[PDB]
Amino acid sequence: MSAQDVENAVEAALDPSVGPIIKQQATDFIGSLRSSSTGWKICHEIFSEKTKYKPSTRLICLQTLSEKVREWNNESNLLELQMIRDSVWSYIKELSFLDEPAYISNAVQHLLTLLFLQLYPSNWNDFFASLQGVIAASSQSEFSNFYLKVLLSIGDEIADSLVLKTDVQIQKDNLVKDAIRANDMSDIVSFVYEMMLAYSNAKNYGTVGLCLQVYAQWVSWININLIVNEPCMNLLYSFLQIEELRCAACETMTEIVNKKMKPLEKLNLLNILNLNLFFSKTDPNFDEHVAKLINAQGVELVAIKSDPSSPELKENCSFQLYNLFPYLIRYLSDDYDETSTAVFPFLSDLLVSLRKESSSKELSASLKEFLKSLLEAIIKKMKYDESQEWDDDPDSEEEAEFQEMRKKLKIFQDTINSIDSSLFSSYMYSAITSSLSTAATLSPENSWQLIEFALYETYIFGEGLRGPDAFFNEVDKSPTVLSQILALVTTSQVCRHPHPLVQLLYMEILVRYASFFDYESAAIPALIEYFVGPRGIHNTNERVRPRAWYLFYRFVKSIKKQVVNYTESSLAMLGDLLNISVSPVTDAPVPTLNSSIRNSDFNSQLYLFETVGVLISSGNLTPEEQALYCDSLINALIGKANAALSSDLSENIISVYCSLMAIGNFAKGFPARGEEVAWLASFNKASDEIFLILDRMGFNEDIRGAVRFTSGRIINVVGPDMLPKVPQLISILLNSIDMNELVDVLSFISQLIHIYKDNMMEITNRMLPTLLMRIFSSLSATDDAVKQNDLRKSYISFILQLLNKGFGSILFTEENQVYFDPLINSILHFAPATQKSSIALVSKMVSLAGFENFTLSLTPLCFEMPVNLVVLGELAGLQKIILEKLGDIYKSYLVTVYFPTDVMASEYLQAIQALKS
Ligand SMILES: [Ca+2]
Ligand SMILES: [Ca+2]
């Protein structure tokens, strides 16, 4: 018995008392059934036989049959596919399988689906018609659901928006849909709605729900005319009042609302919904759903009003839109962030259309009332959670998402402040006012969220102001709302508040609007004691301490003049924070300078130094002390670097680098032009230890930077006397110079040439020799792409400066005369972007030995250009310039010499794309 063999195999596989080889036989048997060309035939019999065979078995038969069907062709295996269908369709009309294990229904669903996918359009024209004919006659709901889970299996194989597409799957799937649309779609939909209604009244939501499942799935490829009917709308909407059905009902309607129909058509459905919503004056997922529903409509109505076209429908549209306003709010102001965000699009799409419509800025009392209602909501939603604390956590806390929902909300505010500024101001002012006031009603422990709100709103309230017209008027001197706020804030006990977030914010507000204190200076003393407060620069919070430093600086920088009487004290307070304890950390198993510096608030601590510098240099502290203090900071960092480098084998690299960087930013703290000084003597004492510091261990590319960088802003202070010693740096620096640093040296001299244009020259001619010797070599040899690009562009630029800075003549000196020729030639060789610079260069040398020869030699470069757009112009630009300096011979040498080596030369000598074409 071919069947009995299958049953013994399967049964062998499930009996756990069977040996491994025996079981092997079975398993191997069952497996063959899928590959062999005879096997599947066996199964075609077994499966339809209920009383003799067990589900255990049939299932495996059904499974093998599917895999067979799935792999067959319509032409090669057509006869076969049909033999099966008839046997399955017969096994289905039976209606005896639903009473068996659910895996045999599901197993069948799958085959039926697969079978359908291959012969339905042409070979199985009565698929749907026959399935529906069965339901009306059997009256067994279990079958109605079967039929539905099928229309659902079919729909799964037919559409998707996934990226894994295939031109074949799309075309095959497209044909099935196209086939369903023209042949059975209209009845499927009619039959579905029918039982949906029926079962609906049967208070039998078990099926009514599968209908909704399908509806929403098939909505995409369902014919529009079939989905516009209202009775079906009125039906789905009624399900809303029902619990098991309402989530299905709401998701399905949203689907119908998104169906991309024509403007004239969408508005009719949207009215059925709109009307139904109007006359209907909780759970969370429901609300997330209803919200999505509303959001969907809203975004539709609004998208439609933009390209309007009747005159009536134009109205209708705006009316439906209006009636959704109470809902847009009712959900925007929801307690659950998820429900609120469900409506942001619509809100956004809407305020954008409103911004366009505020053409006359005439506000109707309804727009007014609406926009207020909207802010009530946008505001409520910007506040931290009153019943929920916050975390310092930077990577996995929900804050990032909160700060996002804030970033959006703020934009809404902006757009509303755009739509109407008075309304925003008045509102935002009250808003900030009360919260603060209310905050006064709460212990500091529960008052922060509220204060944090007000300080945030304040902070963003006025992010685009730059001049006096912002804080106070010009004639009346009446202060804008902004400052009334700032006055208030400044006069609050916000400073005394211990919550970090509030301190930070406060200090940010104080800095963003520092210019304000130039009008109302009173708070100055209180504000500085604050920045130097145990909440300011000494704040314990690992997240605010570093920020405060930056900020302190920024504040001290904007109110430099106002703090000259606070100089002594404040400096004293910064002593501890000027210390350095850099410890090295590291995803990668290894440490580095970068990883180490980041793991420490050094980049922020530099600002602290630069600030001491401002304090010392602008605090009218007598020069007798300002020399004492500056000397005390400089030698303190210097003495530490010396002590370390003076006793141990060369984590001091980091310590040197940073000690280097310290001095550098300390320099930045001081003024850039050096009328006598006392901080000048100290700076001289400074580079001796740096040269002491470079020559001892000046191997790291980083110290290279730090030290180079140090001169850049050190010699910027008292630059005249320093230009003389830079020569020694070029030597030590150019000795160990690598491909990457030779460029940073040109820039160093280049940026340097700008500062001391007149007096840098004599030391320049010394460098050019050692520099150019290094350059020609580096340009002639894992870093090829690196050096080439970096050296190509720096050599190009350095020559340019030297020419305009008036350094040419200096390069004719003894040391340069040996290189003049190659430097000039090499420019010719250099000759898109690079070519452009080189031609400007050759023009620089020209306009500003071998000079005449190089001039002629430029001539061939103009004809050599087309052998390969702006280059072409700058080319005939140098050529145009050529004539002027050489005059009468220049053209005379081109007529006699070049022309000879008749119409192009004619036209040319008179004044390329033509010569090229
Ligand atoms: Ca869902
Ligand atoms: Ca929230």
Curated annotation (Swiss-Prot):
SUPFAM superfamilies: ARM repeat (SSF48371). This is Exportin-T. The keyword Cytoplasm applies. GO terms for molecular function: GTP binding; nuclear export signal receptor activity; small GTPase binding; tRNA binding. GO terms for cellular component: cytoplasm; cytosol; nuclear envelope; nuclear matrix; nuclear pore; nucleus. InterPro entries: ARM-like (IPR011989), ARM-type_fold (IPR016024), Exportin-1/Importin-b-like (IPR013598), Exportin-T_C (IPR045546), XPOT (IPR040017). It is found in: Nucleus; Cytoplasm. tRNA nucleus export receptor which facilitates tRNA translocation across the nuclear pore complex. Involved in pre-tRNA splicing, probably by affecting the interaction of pre-tRNA with splicing endonuclease. Belongs to the exportin family. Disulfide bonds: none annotated. Pfam families: Exportin-T, Xpo1. Keywords: Cytoplasm, Nucleus, RNA-binding, Transport, tRNA processing, tRNA-binding. One of its GO terms (biological process) is tRNA processing. The keyword Ribosomal protein does not apply.
